[PDB]
Amino acid sequence: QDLEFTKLPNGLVIASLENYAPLSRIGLFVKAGSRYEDSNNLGTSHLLRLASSLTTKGASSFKITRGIEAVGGKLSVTATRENMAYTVEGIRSDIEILMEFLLNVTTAPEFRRWEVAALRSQLKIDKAVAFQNSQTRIIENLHDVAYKNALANPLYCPDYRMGKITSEELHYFVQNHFTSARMALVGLGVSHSVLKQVAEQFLNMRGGLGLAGAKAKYRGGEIREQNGDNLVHAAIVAESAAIGNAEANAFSVLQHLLGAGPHIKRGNNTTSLLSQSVAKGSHQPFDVSAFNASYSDSGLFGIYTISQAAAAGEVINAAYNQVKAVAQGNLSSADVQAAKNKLKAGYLMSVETSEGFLSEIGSQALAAGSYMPPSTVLQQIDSVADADVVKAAKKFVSGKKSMAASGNLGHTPFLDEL
């Protein structure tokens, strides 16, 4: 059948699709990302993300872990700067107790102090693993140097805050952001009805709108990190459109016109305006993609480069110059059509998997409360037109930009030189 939606009177969104899949997936989406902290409770969302297997009012940690592993199901937590999503999946004959476990974890945690004291070492271990890939550090830093208060908060806990996060901070964060008006329960392979019954036994008691977050403010700037890596990573972004505008579609078409990462294995972005240009700056290993990250109040768009330290300068300059050409109207309609085809194929392959489909429905729910059929999107992306793309470009080319660099930065340029 099709997707089916009810908005409960306490604000909770219920979305269901019954496709008779053998494994069914049920997720719950909360507007409780890292942007809702301030300077007093930094890293609380990271410990909340890692604290999904703790003792709840209804099931202990042992009961939750052994009961999910007894049926072979999976419980995972994915977190962005805006949103958290707790997802369980398993056989249709065990999703009743899977919803019991998931809704107990979302609605009634206990946050015992010895459990979080044991979890802080796992918090330290997780941070590093996450920061192995440099692209994590550079991007994290980028958001930080490019925002003042809200989106500048890191996804991972700072080093000083480990050992300082308490049970009361987790309880305050849950009581202020895990309310029914900020939650959507999305189920693929389940009946809508059951979602509702579990949405009344749970998800209905906490029904405020919660604590409203601050508006994110752009700051500009540049933070660098000399650490002696073999490759220089550099991200240069500027403020862009937010979630809910056609200029966001223009910026997505703009990143797919510039290189959005080679499609082919070991690909060279043959027609990627950015990468193609890099040739002039250098003929050595490089990687210049476009970074677009848009959140419900603000967006970041820019270029991302990995290169040898020595050539790091002009390669960055070459990439920047290519965007300036797009800001001068130097583009062809076939290139924009290919960018639109790449963007729509990427969207369809993102929603072709079950967990990506459940995430999409989830995001749409929290964001606009409505489901937008894949088809609808296709025609809206088509709405973006050439001039629109050019426009977004000039925004980047003119908007004060931020910059996060890491590596041997002896030949990496600055913003006033860039």
Partner: protein, 98 residues
Amino acid sequence: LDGFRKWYYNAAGFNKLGLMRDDTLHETEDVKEAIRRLPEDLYNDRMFRIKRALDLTMRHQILPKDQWTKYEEDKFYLEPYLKEVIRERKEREEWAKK
């Protein structure tokens, strides 16, 4: 029964060393897990009370009668934390049984 429990509390004699009831529990695995889950101030008072009782037993003395632990006053602090350890312990055991 209440007065006879007070008389037995005086006859047990750990109040004369300033100890609580939960200080006198034998540290098994469950008791050590309950002690580890204590807050820092309660743990520090328990360790000081045990050290003072050991010093008094070394000198073969007791506290003055005004400093003894009144039956009514004794607080069963470890008890709440202990029940949980036992509860969790049993739950786990049952799971294995089944």
